[PDB]
């Protein structure tokens, strides 16, 4: 008996494909260092949890909250980065405005893409500390719900899909933007994979 | 322009259907008081967010983190309780053991339902403070991942479905069990809607 | 080598001394059940941490984040309740308005005690989930800073003293007020130990 | 009526005084960028809270949880960095081992400074995400309690003094160590201001 392990997905493009918005130096360590670290961290914790389940680690030889909380940290660390990479694309394929159903929903709920961009940027910059900014598609209400995560595992909304995702941990921009997170946020719009976003949304319509 | 509002789902059974495991007094206020409060809280915050989007509330007339964080609190409060009600059933329909694919997965990953129950109960009782204990079906790895939430919005794992959900806020058991949360957890197994659980799991296989 | 253990302080009054604002039934289990549970939880975790330090628990036989986070949960659980009991007093000795330096500071920063009461009550009721509402005396700025804690260990401000403390976990009022936390908050003002508060403030002036 | 504003304390040394353990480039932006940002953020929120108190911002023109939570974030951001700067010193004045009462307490509770260093380093590296690692002096138990903070405001222990403090946000080491936080932690021991630590501890004995 055991749990299936996680696997680092391949990057959808070269590490420099996002320049000049996000330097290849950032992407390189962000993917090969940070993301890989989450896959590894999640897997080692799964191996440890398997031992708890099998009884190879008996009472007093583990602290369950440390394992469980470490798992939500690493698993989300992996899942969110995997979404992050696929949510971006080199300028041209990336950037611009959304079309199809996504654009329609955005207009109905925010008036226009231009307004949405403002509100999202504003909400992303209001995030106290490290975390993420995402646009959910609530399959229950049909609302494109904006949300900011603190760390990788706090503030998520249960079961619904992430359509737009922006990494706000400092390692996602520091080497290039230093402490100017807001400039990184502005630059990020230029590599958003709107087509992938529309494609994902379609799956829930 | 606006967001669609949330609606309190009807209870799947009478308020006393879960006795003697969970008194009708608890269920009554838990549903009509607590759950309804989340729907209302979420909706009023949505109305407020609409005003921010439309500009009826201008700069300096709102604190976005208060709205956004209040939304994750109330929206999850609503969604999780909605899952909670459907995840239980009067003794007979509720309780017992799971069958089908769910039982198979449980045996492959935990050895047996008996072991799973132990590990879940142990993990649920380790929760520091109020929150939830859930069993996820990770569509990525195929793992039935156990997790404890702190409050309604901390520790969730992105996008994956909740198969089993246990409410651990004090209002879910205090009136009947006082501070003996562990006794409430033991009693809860008797009303778990395993059929609904198998049904939900099937949807992702 | 070892760490000193914590001790449950004696209650400053009889368990019914706070009626009719907080029933003796609540106080009884709140002190003998909940508070005692924190002292015990903190001590057992300290014993476990001692074993990690001494090496009796070797690598792979513990998950440090579980121990450390369990310690902040239980230690604060103990400390905050200890402050809570001393921050209240039977009607007469408790309730009313503050005098001395505390009253003056309140007037300078909030205009009046009445205004302060309003803002504090408003802030306490805005707390999403379980936790606490406190009035700090920031020794750095001299500000009587209001704050809400989520659970027992989130949102504290480093090193400064708590002058006013209100428990907002459901077990502090459920048996008597059920889900009407706001009514409990209003009733609480009637047992606030303003003299003890003035006394504590004096120590930092 | 109003609240007193916070002030950025002057750096205790030149921005390059901590090299080669922490580059002057990091210190420069860490102090002039990050720390200053917290003082400013705290003050603007205080100004806003004053308006809520005075009534210049009426109902519906603010979201109290956003103000209150933003205050704990920024105030701690300021206080913790202020402690951080004073807790370090150029090599010579900094680094080495503690003496006096601090050393004795460390020996009684951890066996030796060497063991303490190991446990602290281990605990600091276990921190999931950004935050801090601190050594508290619990005035209640007399325990030198280790703790890791998540972000600037989560996991603190009420009212007790911080003797040792290590910043674990990525901006404290990224420019020099990139994602190798553990190497930064090892290097940090070389600039710990043990004398200041002993001095602060003395105040509570
Ligand atoms: Fe990242
Ligand atoms: Fe509930
Ligand atoms: Fe309590
Ligand atoms: Fe810092």
PDB file of C-alpha atoms and ligand atoms in Angstrom, chain D residues 30 81 167 171, ligand 4:
ATOM      1  CA  UNK D  30      15.954  45.661   3.060  1.00  0.00           C
ATOM      2  CA  UNK D  81      12.785  44.446  11.389  1.00  0.00           C
ATOM      3  CA  UNK D 167      14.312  37.120   9.141  1.00  0.00           C
ATOM      4  CA  UNK D 171      14.182  39.482   0.423  1.00  0.00           C
TER       5      UNK D 171
HETATM    6 FE1  LIG E   4      12.723  41.465   6.060  1.00  0.00          FE
END
